[PDB]
């Protein structure tokens, strides 16, 4: 699972998303162990989307961050995934978050690094419950496009929700 | 964060630790990308402790797994850390996990692999809020000695509850 309310200041930010709703990037645990320009290429993508973004982040502030995007050292990932404004989930593709993504039926953009992460996202994509990015090159536009598909094209939400 | 209750099945288990209480190993997101013997070493340290242990895990069941230790592909880490029966948190030391442990008063053993994790754990260690393992060599007994100290010496708790 059941989802509990969010902290006030965070609820306030989610509610400011009107009918566009929210994107959650959690955990982004391996972003700090990548180049400043990767975080940038991503922040560039997140910025150009009408959704508010809550991005689970600890390192240096990306200098492409949007006014849509807020960086938090800790997020209630699960509480957010259960929010009625959540449209998409961004994750490395650790099994834990994909279980919560499935539970609450929130379709995903994967950004894997290690085989574990690649094969988990490959699986959800084969089930049309996610799109994936990077490994092979990546442009902001590649992520941006991935993000507008899953958010706006309702088939990805049908597909994740046939898994729960 | 607040902690909502666990799933009934996970509550039966947690309650089966009586006056020993529980250890949470979550997420251990990188356990999948290290050798089988690594898991078998850790499992051998977890088995040697009267606590029940919930380990967030998604590969090949370790063959030195204890009867006290159960593997789960997903955990409600935050609800577990909340639970009044929790004694110790084992984590790679990512920022997110150290935030819930601070919030809830749960001392930690870090098993860090990256710099952000090596730093976060070194801070916690110096606050007297955690011990740390691996990097340099690593034997089961190092992880056991660490565990018993944090579970049993009430100082490590006292220190983490000054941080919250």
Swiss-Prot record, chains A, B:
Expressed in various tissues including the liver, kidney, testis, uterus, placenta, mammary gland, adrenal gland, skin and prostate. It is found in: Endoplasmic reticulum membrane. It comes from the Eukaryota. Glycans are attached at residue 33. UDP-glucuronosyltransferase (UGT) that catalyzes phase II biotransformation reactions in which lipophilic substrates are conjugated with glucuronic acid to increase the metabolite's water solubility, thereby facilitating excretion into either the urine or bile. Catalyzes the glucuronidation of endogenous steroid hormones such as androgens (epitestosterone, androsterone) and estrogens (estradiol, epiestradiol). Belongs to the UDP-glycosyltransferase family. This is UDP-glucuronosyltransferase 2B17. It comes from Homo sapiens (Human).
């Amino acid at each position: 699972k059941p989802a509990k309310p969010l902290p006030k200041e965070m609820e306030e930010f989610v509610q400011s998303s009107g009918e566009n709703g929210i994107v959650v990037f959690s955990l982004g645990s391996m972003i700090s162990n990548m180049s400043e320009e990767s975080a940038n290429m991503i922040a560039s993508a997140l910025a150009q989307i009408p959704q508010k973004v809550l991005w689970r982040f600890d390192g240096k502030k990306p200098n492409t961050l949007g006014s849509n995007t807020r960086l938090y050292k800790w997020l209630p990932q699960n509480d957010l995934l259960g929010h009625p404004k959540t449209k998409a989930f961004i994750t490395h593709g650790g099994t834990n978050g994909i279980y919560e993504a499935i539970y609450h039926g929130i379709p995903m953009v994967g950004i894997p690094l290690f085989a574990d992460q690649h094969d988990n996202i490959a699986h959800m994509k084969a089930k049309g419950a996610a799109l994936s990015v990077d490994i092979r090159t990546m442009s902001s536009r590649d992520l941006l496009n991935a993000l507008k598909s899953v958010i706006n094209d309702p088939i990805y939400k049908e597909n994740i929700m046939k898994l729960s």
